[PDB]
């Protein structure tokens, strides 16, 4: 198995900008074959042996977001920086 | 005396963007001749008879800000949206 990855439970929610229903991250990561454990608000995710591409929290975020569907991500223009 | 005015104790701070020391608003408003009573966090301000220009909380805000000095107000860029 690849080494375990520590990641906050709401990290996919923050990066997506969507408040997913609770347990979405844990369910999706378990769906793709990873072992997920809880420690307060921090998950420890061990990817399956056939997923060496999952090495960082960003890799896990893509798994949750693509399975939930990028279409649910709202179009929110960022504020204009003083250019 | 003009009618009394109700105003939050920190309203001058919010409009100025400056955290004034405690009691600044009450001290400045009593300085210019108004009667100030405290009801928790809400100030009741009765301006003196020679100040018929003090009718709204914004008027009291100007009194506090101008006496503390507009030079203490910092320079912060507003959150303009994408145009
Ligand atoms: Mg990936
Ligand atoms: Mg005025």
Curated annotation (Swiss-Prot), chains A, B:
Where does the UniProt annotation locate this protein? Cytoplasm
Amino acids binding Mg(2+)? 53, 59, 62-63
For the B5 domain, which residue ranges apply? Answer: 1-75
By sequence similarity, the record places it as follows: Belongs to the phenylalanyl-tRNA synthetase beta subunit family. Type 1 subfamily.
Task: Look up the further comments and give them.
Answer: Was identified as a high-confidence drug target.
Q: How does it assemble?
A: Tetramer of two alpha and two beta subunits.
This chain belongs to which protein, by name? Answer: Phenylalanine--tRNA ligase beta subunit
Q: Which gene encodes it?
A: pheT
Q: Which residues of the full protein are shown?
A: 415 to 497 of 831
């Amino acid at each position: 198995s690849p080494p375990p990855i520590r990641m906050g439970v709401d990290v996919p929610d923050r990066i997506a900008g969507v408040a997913y229903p609770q347990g979405t991250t844990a369910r999706r990561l378990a769906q793709i074959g990873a072992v997920v454990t809880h420690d307060g608000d921090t998950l420890t995710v061990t990817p399956p042996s056939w997923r060496p591409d999952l090495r960082q929290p960003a890799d896990l975020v893509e798994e949750v977001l693509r399975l939930e569907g990028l279409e649910v991500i709202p179009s929110v223009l960022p504020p204009a920086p003083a250019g």
